[PDB]
Structures are given as C-alpha cells and as structure tokens.
Amino acid sequence: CVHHIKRRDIVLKWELGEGAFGKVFLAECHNLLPDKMLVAVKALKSARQDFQREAELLTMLQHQHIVRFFGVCTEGRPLLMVFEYMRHGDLNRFLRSHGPDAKLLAGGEDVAPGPLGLGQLLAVASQVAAGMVYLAGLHFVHRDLATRNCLVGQGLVVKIGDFGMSRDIYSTDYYRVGGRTMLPIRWMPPESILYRKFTTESDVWSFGVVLWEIFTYGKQPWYQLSNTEAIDCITQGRELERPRACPPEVYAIMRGCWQREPQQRHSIKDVHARLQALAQAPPV
C-alpha cells in the first residue's frame, strides 16, 4: 500500500525539468529515513484518478535496479510523487557527458572524466538488463525503454525510471506514426511500429538498442536518418552498425535482441547473464 508524506517535510530547491503534465524538482525530505535528505519530486498539473493508480503501481515495483519511490503527498495541491535523487540525471545525458563529442569535461567526484572503461560500460548495461529481468518476471511491459528513461546515481548505480515527460524533454526521439500516437520509433521493432504490438519481445528489442546507445555514448539510433527513413530501415530489417567502442561479443548480444521473429529473440534473462559474465571478464 501507498506511503504518504507530509507537505511540511518536503522543501523544493529548484526545477530540474518539465513536461505538459508535470514539473520535476530537486528537494529535501525531512523525516523520510532515519535524516535531512535529497530527493526528486514530481509535481502534477480525472487526473487525480490515474495518479492514484500510478502511485499504487510503482509501490509494487521494488527492485535494486528500479528507481526508488518513497511515496506521495496528496494533502492539498499539487499532487506530489517523491523519488530518490539520482545525481547524474538520465542515462542518456550521463553517457553524452562522457562521450568524445562532450565539449566541457564531466565533473563529480564519483566517476572519472572522459570515456568509460569496457568494464563500466558493461556494468551499466548489466544493471539495466537486471531491471528488465525483474519487470519481465512480473509480466510488466515497459513500452518505452531507452537510456533517456533510465537514471544514474551516486557511484554509477543505474536504475530504470523516468518522470513521464520524455516526450517533451526528448521530443526528437518520438514520431507520430500514421499521424497518430507519439511513439519512440528508433527503439521499436517492426511489429510495434507496423501493428502497435508491445510485448516482452518488444522490450528486449528495445534493450538491444539501449546497448547500442551505451556503446555510442548516447548517440541517437539512426541519427543521420529522418523519422520516415528510420521507419523504412527498421521495417526492412536493417540493423544498427557495431559501434567503434563495441567488441564483437557485445554486438552479438545486440543482434540477438534484433531477431525479426519476436519469438527468436533471446530472453532478457539470457542477455543479462551474458552481460554480467562479460562485465566480470571484459574481452580485449
């Protein structure tokens, strides 16, 4: 059941991001854990209904690699959801800040500036896969797996989670297929793009693309192509090229995720195992 938090224990510092349905803030939460504490707060703008359902949903989803939900404040307005603060923001931004295109050098005291090591890129992937293993186990279908929708905390702990506003912060990553719903086409398999079928196999395909993002420091997939060009590529069975950073045994894991027949795609469980393995013993 849902944990509740007193508005007086929540003190906003400043806005972090914004969508058409909410703002996210950085803030301090008193008396949350045995104290004074940094957290992320989603402030919401019929509505109070979906909010309640969603609040219950993400109290059921507890796992070492799912962003931690602390509770809600429904006492008055606006409706607040409280999450653990992940100091490095979304995984996409974290990756780009350690890429070769990065203008300014990345700061912080918990990770070195510049390119990550193979071991580190691998553990990043393994941590996301771990969270996807969990979800699959609950027959939960994510539908929008991308590095933009993972978060990175203290010490490079990586967790799946977002604040429901990626379509606004990262609109370039969504396209109205057929002029209908905004979909993250570059992360989608043909059956999802063509027929809007979203499954566990759909998610493993997306994980394949996440691996690619990870080994390209967050480049957008098919970044040289327009949305219609990307749809054509994916539809015809063109696969993203192996990244320069990427060793063959890792690229083989990607291609496993990109089997055209959904049932031919390796399970998330296997992908996780082969990723942990490699992280422990990174090839050359």
CSV table of C-alpha atoms in Angstrom, one decimal:
chain,number,residue,atom,x,y,z
A,1,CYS,CA,0.0,0.0,0.0
A,2,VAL,CA,0.9,3.7,-0.7
A,3,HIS,CA,3.2,5.6,1.7
A,4,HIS,CA,2.2,9.2,2.4
A,5,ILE,CA,4.4,12.2,3.1
A,6,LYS,CA,3.6,15.4,4.9
A,7,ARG,CA,4.0,18.6,2.7
A,8,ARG,CA,5.9,20.2,5.5
A,9,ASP,CA,8.7,17.6,5.3
A,10,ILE,CA,9.1,18.5,1.6
A,11,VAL,CA,11.1,21.5,0.7
A,12,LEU,CA,11.7,22.3,-3.0
A,13,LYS,CA,15.1,23.7,-4.1
A,14,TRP,CA,14.6,24.2,-7.8
A,15,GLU,CA,13.1,22.8,-11.0
A,16,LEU,CA,15.0,20.1,-12.9
A,17,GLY,CA,12.7,19.5,-15.8
A,18,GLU,CA,9.2,19.9,-17.2
A,19,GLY,CA,6.5,18.3,-19.4
A,20,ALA,CA,2.9,19.1,-20.4
A,21,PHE,CA,1.7,17.1,-17.4
A,22,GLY,CA,4.2,17.9,-14.6
A,23,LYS,CA,7.4,19.6,-13.3
A,24,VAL,CA,10.2,17.8,-11.6
A,25,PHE,CA,12.1,19.4,-8.7
A,26,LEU,CA,15.2,18.7,-6.7
A,27,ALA,CA,14.3,19.0,-3.0
A,28,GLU,CA,14.9,17.9,0.6
A,29,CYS,CA,12.7,15.5,2.5
A,30,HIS,CA,12.7,15.5,6.4
A,31,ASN,CA,11.8,12.5,8.5
A,32,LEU,CA,11.8,10.2,5.5
A,33,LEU,CA,14.6,8.0,6.6
A,34,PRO,CA,16.4,7.6,10.0
A,35,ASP,CA,17.9,12.4,8.1
A,36,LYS,CA,17.5,15.7,6.1
A,37,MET,CA,17.6,14.2,2.6
A,38,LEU,CA,17.8,15.0,-1.1
A,39,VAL,CA,15.1,13.6,-3.3
A,40,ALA,CA,13.4,14.2,-6.7
A,41,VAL,CA,9.7,15.4,-6.6
A,42,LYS,CA,7.3,15.1,-9.5
A,43,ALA,CA,4.6,17.8,-9.1
A,44,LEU,CA,1.5,17.0,-11.2
A,45,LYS,CA,-0.7,19.5,-13.2
A,46,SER,CA,-9.8,12.5,-13.8
A,47,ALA,CA,-6.2,13.4,-13.2
A,48,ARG,CA,-6.3,12.5,-9.5
A,49,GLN,CA,-7.6,9.1,-10.7
A,50,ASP,CA,-4.7,8.0,-12.9
A,51,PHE,CA,-2.4,9.5,-10.3
A,52,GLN,CA,-3.7,7.1,-7.6
A,53,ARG,CA,-3.5,4.1,-9.9
A,54,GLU,CA,0.1,5.0,-10.9
A,55,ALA,CA,1.1,5.6,-7.3
A,56,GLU,CA,-0.1,2.1,-6.4
A,57,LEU,CA,1.6,0.6,-9.5
A,58,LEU,CA,5.1,1.9,-8.6
A,59,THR,CA,4.8,0.8,-5.0
A,60,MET,CA,4.5,-2.7,-6.3
A,61,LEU,CA,7.7,-2.3,-8.4
A,62,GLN,CA,10.5,-2.6,-5.9
A,63,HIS,CA,14.0,-3.8,-7.1
A,64,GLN,CA,17.6,-2.8,-6.8
A,65,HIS,CA,17.6,-1.5,-10.4
A,66,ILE,CA,14.2,0.3,-10.4
A,67,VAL,CA,14.3,3.9,-9.3
A,68,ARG,CA,13.1,4.1,-5.7
A,69,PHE,CA,9.7,5.5,-4.9
A,70,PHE,CA,9.2,6.9,-1.4
A,71,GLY,CA,5.6,7.9,-1.6
A,72,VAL,CA,3.0,10.6,-2.4
A,73,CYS,CA,1.7,13.9,-0.9
A,74,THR,CA,-2.0,14.1,-1.8
A,75,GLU,CA,-2.7,16.6,1.0
A,76,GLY,CA,-3.8,19.7,-1.0
A,77,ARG,CA,-2.2,20.7,-4.3
A,78,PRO,CA,-0.3,20.0,-6.3
A,79,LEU,CA,-0.1,16.2,-6.2
A,80,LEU,CA,3.5,15.2,-5.4
A,81,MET,CA,5.4,12.0,-6.1
A,82,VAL,CA,8.7,11.6,-4.2
A,83,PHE,CA,11.7,9.6,-5.6
A,84,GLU,CA,15.3,9.0,-4.6
A,85,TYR,CA,17.6,11.7,-6.1
A,86,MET,CA,19.9,10.3,-8.9
A,87,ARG,CA,22.7,12.9,-9.0
A,88,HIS,CA,23.8,12.2,-12.6
A,89,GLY,CA,20.4,12.5,-14.2
A,90,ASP,CA,19.2,10.4,-17.0
A,91,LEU,CA,21.5,7.7,-18.5
A,92,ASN,CA,21.4,9.4,-21.9
A,93,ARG,CA,22.8,12.7,-20.6
A,94,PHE,CA,25.3,10.8,-18.4
A,95,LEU,CA,26.6,8.9,-21.4
A,96,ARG,CA,26.9,12.0,-23.7
A,97,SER,CA,28.8,13.8,-20.9
A,98,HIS,CA,31.5,11.1,-21.1
A,99,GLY,CA,31.5,10.8,-24.9
A,100,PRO,CA,34.1,12.1,-27.3
A,101,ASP,CA,31.7,14.9,-28.5
A,102,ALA,CA,31.5,16.2,-25.0
A,103,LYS,CA,32.6,19.8,-25.1
A,104,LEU,CA,33.1,20.5,-21.4
A,105,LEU,CA,34.8,17.9,-19.2
A,106,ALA,CA,32.4,15.9,-17.0
A,107,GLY,CA,32.7,16.7,-13.2
A,108,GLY,CA,31.8,15.0,-10.0
A,109,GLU,CA,33.9,13.0,-7.5
A,110,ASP,CA,32.5,9.5,-8.1
A,111,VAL,CA,33.5,8.8,-11.7
A,112,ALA,CA,36.5,9.8,-13.8
A,113,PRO,CA,36.1,12.5,-16.6
A,114,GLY,CA,36.2,11.2,-20.2
A,115,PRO,CA,35.4,7.8,-21.8
A,116,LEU,CA,34.2,5.0,-19.5
A,117,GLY,CA,36.1,1.7,-19.4
A,118,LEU,CA,34.7,-1.5,-21.0
A,119,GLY,CA,34.0,-2.9,-17.5
A,120,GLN,CA,32.0,0.2,-16.7
A,121,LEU,CA,30.0,0.3,-20.0
A,122,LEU,CA,29.3,-3.4,-19.4
A,123,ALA,CA,28.1,-2.9,-15.8
A,124,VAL,CA,25.9,-0.1,-16.9
A,125,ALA,CA,24.3,-2.5,-19.4
A,126,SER,CA,24.1,-5.3,-16.9
A,127,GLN,CA,22.3,-3.0,-14.4
A,128,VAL,CA,19.6,-2.0,-17.0
A,129,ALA,CA,19.2,-5.6,-18.1
A,130,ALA,CA,18.8,-6.6,-14.4
A,131,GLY,CA,15.9,-4.2,-14.0
A,132,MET,CA,14.3,-5.5,-17.2
A,133,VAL,CA,14.6,-9.1,-15.9
A,134,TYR,CA,12.6,-8.1,-12.9
A,135,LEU,CA,9.9,-6.4,-14.9
A,136,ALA,CA,9.5,-9.3,-17.3
A,137,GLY,CA,9.2,-11.6,-14.3
A,138,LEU,CA,6.0,-9.6,-13.4
A,139,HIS,CA,4.8,-9.7,-17.0
A,140,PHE,CA,5.1,-5.9,-16.9
A,141,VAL,CA,5.7,-4.3,-20.4
A,142,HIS,CA,7.6,-1.1,-20.3
A,143,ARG,CA,7.0,0.1,-23.9
A,144,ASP,CA,9.5,3.0,-23.8
A,145,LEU,CA,12.9,1.6,-22.8
A,146,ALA,CA,15.7,4.0,-23.7
A,147,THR,CA,18.7,5.5,-21.8
A,148,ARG,CA,16.7,8.7,-21.5
A,149,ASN,CA,14.3,6.6,-19.4
A,150,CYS,CA,17.0,5.2,-17.0
A,151,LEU,CA,18.7,7.1,-14.2
A,152,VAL,CA,22.2,7.2,-12.8
A,153,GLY,CA,23.0,7.8,-9.2
A,154,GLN,CA,25.9,8.0,-6.8
A,155,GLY,CA,28.7,5.7,-7.7
A,156,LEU,CA,27.3,4.9,-11.1
A,157,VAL,CA,24.4,2.8,-9.9
A,158,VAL,CA,22.0,2.7,-12.8
A,159,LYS,CA,18.2,2.2,-12.5
A,160,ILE,CA,15.2,2.2,-14.7
A,161,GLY,CA,12.9,5.1,-14.1
A,162,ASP,CA,11.6,8.4,-15.6
A,163,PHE,CA,9.1,11.1,-14.7
A,164,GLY,CA,6.6,10.7,-17.5
A,165,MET,CA,7.8,13.7,-19.6
A,166,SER,CA,10.3,12.2,-22.0
A,167,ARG,CA,8.0,13.0,-25.0
A,168,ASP,CA,8.7,16.7,-24.1
A,169,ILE,CA,12.3,16.8,-22.9
A,170,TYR,CA,13.3,14.4,-25.7
A,171,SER,CA,10.7,15.0,-28.4
A,172,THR,CA,13.2,14.3,-31.2
A,173,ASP,CA,13.0,10.6,-30.0
A,174,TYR,CA,9.3,10.4,-30.8
A,175,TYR,CA,7.3,10.4,-34.0
A,176,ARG,CA,3.5,10.2,-34.8
A,177,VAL,CA,3.4,7.1,-36.9
A,178,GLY,CA,0.5,7.4,-39.3
A,179,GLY,CA,-0.1,10.8,-37.7
A,180,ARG,CA,-1.4,9.1,-34.6
A,181,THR,CA,0.3,8.5,-31.2
A,182,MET,CA,3.8,9.7,-30.5
A,183,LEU,CA,6.0,6.6,-30.5
A,184,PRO,CA,9.7,6.1,-29.8
A,185,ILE,CA,10.2,4.5,-33.3
A,186,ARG,CA,14.0,4.3,-33.2
A,187,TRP,CA,13.8,2.0,-30.2
A,188,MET,CA,10.9,-0.1,-31.7
A,189,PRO,CA,10.8,-3.5,-33.6
A,190,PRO,CA,8.8,-3.8,-36.8
A,191,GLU,CA,5.7,-5.4,-35.2
A,192,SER,CA,5.4,-2.5,-32.8
A,193,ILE,CA,5.8,0.1,-35.5
A,194,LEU,CA,3.6,-1.6,-38.0
A,195,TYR,CA,0.9,-3.1,-35.7
A,196,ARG,CA,1.4,-1.4,-32.3
A,197,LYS,CA,2.0,-4.7,-30.7
A,198,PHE,CA,4.0,-4.2,-27.5
A,199,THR,CA,5.3,-7.2,-25.6
A,200,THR,CA,8.2,-8.6,-23.7
A,201,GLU,CA,9.9,-9.3,-27.0
A,202,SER,CA,9.3,-5.7,-27.9
A,203,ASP,CA,11.1,-4.7,-24.8
A,204,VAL,CA,14.1,-7.0,-25.4
A,205,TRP,CA,14.4,-5.4,-28.9
A,206,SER,CA,14.5,-2.0,-27.2
A,207,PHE,CA,17.1,-3.2,-24.8
A,208,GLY,CA,19.3,-4.1,-27.8
A,209,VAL,CA,19.0,-0.5,-28.9
A,210,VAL,CA,19.9,0.6,-25.3
A,211,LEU,CA,23.1,-1.5,-25.5
A,212,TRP,CA,23.9,0.4,-28.7
A,213,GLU,CA,23.3,3.7,-27.1
A,214,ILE,CA,25.6,2.7,-24.3
A,215,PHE,CA,28.4,1.9,-26.7
A,216,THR,CA,27.9,5.1,-28.7
A,217,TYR,CA,27.8,7.3,-25.6
A,218,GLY,CA,24.1,8.0,-26.2
A,219,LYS,CA,24.0,8.8,-29.9
A,220,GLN,CA,20.5,8.7,-31.2
A,221,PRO,CA,20.0,5.5,-33.2
A,222,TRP,CA,19.9,6.2,-37.0
A,223,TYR,CA,20.9,9.8,-36.1
A,224,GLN,CA,21.7,10.6,-39.8
A,225,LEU,CA,18.2,9.5,-40.9
A,226,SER,CA,14.8,11.2,-40.8
A,227,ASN,CA,11.9,9.6,-39.0
A,228,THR,CA,10.5,8.2,-42.3
A,229,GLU,CA,13.9,6.9,-43.3
A,230,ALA,CA,14.3,5.2,-39.9
A,231,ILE,CA,10.9,3.5,-40.2
A,232,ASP,CA,11.9,2.3,-43.6
A,233,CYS,CA,15.2,1.0,-42.3
A,234,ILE,CA,13.7,-0.9,-39.3
A,235,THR,CA,10.8,-2.2,-41.4
A,236,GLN,CA,13.2,-3.7,-44.0
A,237,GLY,CA,15.4,-5.4,-41.4
A,238,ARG,CA,18.4,-3.1,-41.5
A,239,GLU,CA,20.4,-3.3,-38.2
A,240,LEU,CA,22.4,-0.6,-36.5
A,241,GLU,CA,26.1,-0.9,-37.1
A,242,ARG,CA,28.5,-2.1,-34.5
A,243,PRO,CA,29.9,0.9,-32.6
A,244,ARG,CA,33.7,1.6,-32.5
A,245,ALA,CA,33.9,1.0,-28.8
A,246,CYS,CA,32.0,-2.2,-29.2
A,247,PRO,CA,33.6,-5.7,-29.1
A,248,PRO,CA,32.1,-8.5,-31.3
A,249,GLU,CA,30.8,-10.5,-28.3
A,250,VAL,CA,28.7,-7.5,-27.3
A,251,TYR,CA,27.5,-6.7,-30.8
A,252,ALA,CA,26.4,-10.3,-31.0
A,253,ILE,CA,24.2,-9.7,-27.9
A,254,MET,CA,22.6,-6.7,-29.7
A,255,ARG,CA,21.9,-8.8,-32.8
A,256,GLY,CA,20.3,-11.4,-30.6
A,257,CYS,CA,17.8,-8.8,-29.5
A,258,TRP,CA,17.1,-7.8,-33.0
A,259,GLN,CA,15.8,-11.1,-34.4
A,260,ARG,CA,13.0,-10.3,-36.8
A,261,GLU,CA,10.7,-13.0,-35.4
A,262,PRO,CA,9.8,-11.9,-31.9
A,263,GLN,CA,10.0,-15.5,-30.6
A,264,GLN,CA,13.5,-15.8,-32.0
A,265,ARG,CA,14.8,-13.0,-29.7
A,266,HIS,CA,17.0,-14.2,-26.7
A,267,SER,CA,15.2,-13.8,-23.4
A,268,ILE,CA,16.1,-10.8,-21.2
A,269,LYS,CA,17.3,-13.3,-18.7
A,270,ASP,CA,19.9,-14.8,-21.0
A,271,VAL,CA,21.1,-11.3,-22.1
A,272,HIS,CA,21.6,-10.3,-18.5
A,273,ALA,CA,23.6,-13.4,-17.8
A,274,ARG,CA,25.9,-13.0,-20.9
A,275,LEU,CA,26.3,-9.3,-19.9
A,276,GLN,CA,27.2,-9.9,-16.2
A,277,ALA,CA,29.6,-12.6,-17.4
A,278,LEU,CA,31.4,-10.3,-19.8
A,279,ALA,CA,31.5,-7.4,-17.2
A,280,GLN,CA,33.3,-9.7,-14.8
A,281,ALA,CA,35.7,-10.7,-17.5
A,282,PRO,CA,35.9,-8.0,-20.2
A,283,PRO,CA,37.3,-9.1,-23.6
A,284,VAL,CA,40.1,-7.3,-25.5
